[PDB]
Amino acid sequence: ERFDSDRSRYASLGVVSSLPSGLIDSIWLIIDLNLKGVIPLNDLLHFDLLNNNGKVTVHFSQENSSVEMAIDLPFSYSTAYPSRIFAFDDGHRETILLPAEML
Amino acid sequence: MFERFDSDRSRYASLGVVSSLPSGLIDSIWLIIDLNLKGVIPLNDLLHFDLLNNNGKVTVHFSQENSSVEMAIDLPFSYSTAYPSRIFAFDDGHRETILLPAEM
Amino acid sequence: MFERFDSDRSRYASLGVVSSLPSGLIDSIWLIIDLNLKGVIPLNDLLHFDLLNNNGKVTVHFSQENSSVEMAIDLPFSYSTAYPSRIFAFDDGHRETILLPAEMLE
Amino acid sequence: MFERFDSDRSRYASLGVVSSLPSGLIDSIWLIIDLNLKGVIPLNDLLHFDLLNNNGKVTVHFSQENSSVEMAIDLPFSYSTAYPSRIFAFDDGHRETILLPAEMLE
Amino acid sequence: FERFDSDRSRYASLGVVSSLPSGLIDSIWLIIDLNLKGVIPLNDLLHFDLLNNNGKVTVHFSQENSSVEMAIDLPFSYSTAYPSRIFAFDDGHRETILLPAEML
Amino acid sequence: ERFDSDRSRYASLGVVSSLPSGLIDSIWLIIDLNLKGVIPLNDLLHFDLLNNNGKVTVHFSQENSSVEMAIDLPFSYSTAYPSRIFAFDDGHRETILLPAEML
Amino acid sequence: FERFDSDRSRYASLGVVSSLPSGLIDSIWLIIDLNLKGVIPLNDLLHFDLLNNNGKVTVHFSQENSSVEMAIDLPFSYSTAYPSRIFAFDDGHRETILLPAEML
Amino acid sequence: MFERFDSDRSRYASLGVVSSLPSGLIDSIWLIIDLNLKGVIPLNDLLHFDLLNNNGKVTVHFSQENSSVEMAIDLPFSYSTAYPSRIFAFDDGHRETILLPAEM
Q: Are F25 and D94 in contact (CB under 8 A)?
């Protein structure tokens, strides 16, 4: 019912122009395969993108909760990637976006 | 009353689109609108782009509903049999989205 | 020291797969392996995935020879009748490959 | 403007081919196409090559559907009984691929 | 032969790939292919300035011995992290986007 | 009987360190598929490596003969490639080598 | 993590790839992997001088704040066309061989 | 009477070898001999190298006929099922060759 996979899902321009498609999709998968049904979820999820030895580690956290997770993904890391991104659920539409893009 | 595909508002790609095209190619639709369409022709709120194989690379055919302009843009990206034939850019006044036919 | 469907090793997708499933779905198979399988259960070097319609969305059933594990993974993606009904992930010990049953050699 | 087994377009080799013939032989198939076929005869989008033993060296017989041309090309390379007895070159109009008959889809 | 052919392969130098998002790098090439190529003769070396237009990137294009310029407003957000100029160099088989400091 | 394909064939170190395997093999193929049986051949063949629009063109020539040939190959051109190479047949062994390597 | 890991990807800059044969570029990496790594700690930046030893290349290795050097005679022919020094830089996910002029 | 694998003489790879391995990898055998073998151990006129799969990359096992030294060198190149298992370096006094077992 929150980041329900039956409602529409988007990626902002800012995310698309700086991350490859595969990595963006990972985020949805992390939510669907690791997060959903296992923890209650805020309408706003944090995903920091960390350099794990040349590859990308996603670190999931959210507010008013001390449940976090690290997920190693097979994508190459770039210093040009946003350092963190968000998943936001306004109740109709769900979107991966950059922090700057929340205003 | 609104300016179509106005760059000062929020732009999105649908999940459907993000999972079939590379980012580069998606960004191209936007750049095609900003560089070759805006300022040039008046714009429907819904745009059609066809992804064609031109010699192994993608060519985009643009058209739109209530107009007779049609434009063909050769792009650097290589083509895949599994790309959607056709995608849409849709602007609703508040949000601007690149999305799949089926997704409307 | 080496690892079954290691992600540090090259992953390819066959012609039939690449031309028949969108990218986001191919990556899904790899992610299922990486997020749900490695570190969770032991892996055969060959992995069956059935792609099923689940109310218009894709659902992947996983299984392998010599094991009692099955797993259903509901995907956000849209199902299409055009998609191949099953695929394999194969690890020949240096290179990992996703391919269609029709493309297996013997 | 596009071209049959165009060399400006990407050429791949299938898993079965890549793991079963050495590189210099795969390149040979492409070179045969480039040196002996393109510009010489019209090309079907699918090309048969039989790999034959010719006193320990490889000989490639070429043919295609809808054509009366055959060609035998004697290669400098060493024949091995391990090699696949025939391969196909296929051009699906954006990507060119060499593969084994067993790997063809339908 | 043709200056900045799309079918010849294109790279970004270390400095470039490290400090600009892909969409922006893609933009340079697309500004070339969409706005420049076929319209004016190009030098082997092409200047792009990355300017801040109210929080968004604008690209100034110029080149030595042509009075011909162009200003391209882009959809992407601006950052002072970004390099302020970049060059595109066509060495005649390989094309590259690099930072002035990375010239020879 | 000259560059007969039944005698041993080699590539000097100098050639191997500067050209990819596929391109070296091309030379043998050019000789076998285009040259041999069609023209008499010197024990020393010239192959200039030219930039054809980002790709390599091999130009075959040899001495005391005005028969030449251009062959477009699919390999990428590099300014670092030797500008020309040789095929030499001493009567036992046949070798692709750099000009500097003939001494 | 480990300085100049082999499993992390390695590039040569434009200047480098344009003026040295592959075998020589390969050599630098192989000097690292075969002679240096595991034997001394490495900096992110590594100096190689390319010297003429009677018509063949010899590589001098050094690095700032180590008195530790090494001289490696190579089989390859020398050319005055070649750059006289090259650096190897490990930016922490990407490793690169480049010309001093191409540093930042 | 001769110095084994002396760098001051001519080195070759056979056709058999050039058509199964990439140049880089072939150059590695030479560099392995010059960097890790010569000056270190006395050398047979014929050397054995096995190409093993070590985790997707090639590892070379070296041994030689009349000796009990055996050495294993991890290399950056990726492995292929179609590479020969084993190659030889053979030095005959005049020419030095990397070649295939069958080729002797």
A: no
CATH superfamily of this structure's domain F1-103: enterococcus faecalis protein (3.10.450.150)
Whole-angstrom CA distances from G21 to C62, D83, F16, F58, F79 are 48, 33, 10, 18, 9
Q: Please choose, from the candidates E26, E103, E13, A54, the residue with its C-alpha nearest in 3D space to the C-alpha of residue G11.
A: E13
What CATH topology corresponds to C2-106? Answer: Nuclear Transport Factor 2; Chain: A, (3.10.450)
C-alpha span between G68 and G72 (Å, rounded): 14
CB H21 within 8 A of CB H83: yes
Contacts of B22 in chain C (CB under 8 A): 23
| Chain E residue numbers touching B34 (CB-CB < 8 A) | 73-75
Subunit contact C9:H79, Cβ cutoff 8 A: no
- What's the per-residue H, E or C state across chain A? CCCCCCCCEEEEHHHHCCCCHHHHHHHHHHHHHHHECCECCCCEEEEEEEEECCEEEEEEEECCCCCCEEEEEEEECCCCCCCEEEEEECCCCEEEECHHHCC
The total number of residues shown for chain A amounts to 103
Pairing of strands D10-13, D70-78: unpaired
From chain G, pick out residues whose CB is under 8 angstroms from the CB of F102: none
Query: Which DSSP symbol is given to B55?
Result: B
Domain ranges of chain A: 1-103
Is it the case that chain G and chain D have 3 or more CB pairs lying under 8 Å apart? no
In this complex, is the C-beta atom of B103 within 8 Å of any C-beta atom belonging to chain A?
A: yes
DSSP string, chain E: --TT-SSS-EEE-HHHHTTS-HHHHHHHHHHIIIIITTTS---SEEEEEEEEETTEEEEEEE-TT----EEEEEEEEP-TTS-SEEEEEE-SS-EEEE-GGG--
**Cα-based angle G39, G40, G42 (whole degrees, multiple of 5):** 130
Backbone phi and psi for residue B71, each to the nearest 5 degrees, phi listed first: -140, 145
* Chain A residues closer than 8 Å to C28 by CB: 25, 29
Please work out, in degrees rounded to the nearest 5, the angle formed at the alpha carbon of residue D32 by the alpha carbons of D26 and D33.
Answer: 100
N residues, chain H: 104
At the fourth CATH level, which superfamily is domain E1-104? enterococcus faecalis protein (3.10.450.150)
Closest by CA position to B100, among listed B41, B18, B28, B43? B18
Residue F49 tokens read as: 């490596």
Q: Is E4 left (phi over 0), alpha (psi -120 to 50) or beta?
A: left
Neighbour-count burial of B59, counting CB atoms closer than 10 A to its CB (0-12 exposed, 13-18 middle, 19+ buried): middle
Q: Which two tokens stand for residue G16?
A: 């480098």
| Contact present, G32 and H76 (Cβ < 8 Å) | no
Residue type, D85: S
Neighbour count for residue A90 (Cβ, 10 Å): 10
CATH number of B2-103: 2.60.40.10, 3.10.450.150, 3.90.76.10, 2.40.50.1020?
3.10.450.150
With beta carbons less than 8 A apart as the criterion, state whether E29 and E23 touch: no
The closest of F61, F47, F52, F53 to F19, measured between CA atoms, is F47
SS3 B36: helix
- Whether F77 contacts chain G with CB within 8 A: no
E41 touches chain A (CB under 8 A): no
Asked whether the beta carbons of D89 and D5 are under 8 A apart, the reply is yes
Q: How many CB atoms lie within 10 A of CB F40?
A: 11
CB burial of B17-44 (b: ≥16 within 10 Å; e: otherwise) equals bbbbbbbbbbbbbbbbbbbbbbeeeebb
Which are the contacts of A88, defined by CB distance < 8 A and separation ≥ 6?
A43, A44, A45, A94, A95, A96, A97, A102
Overall resolution, Å: 2.9
SS3 label, residue B34: helix
In this structure, are residues G10 and G95 in contact, taking their beta carbons and an 8 Å threshold?
yes
CA distance linking residue A72 with residue A58, whole number of Å = 6
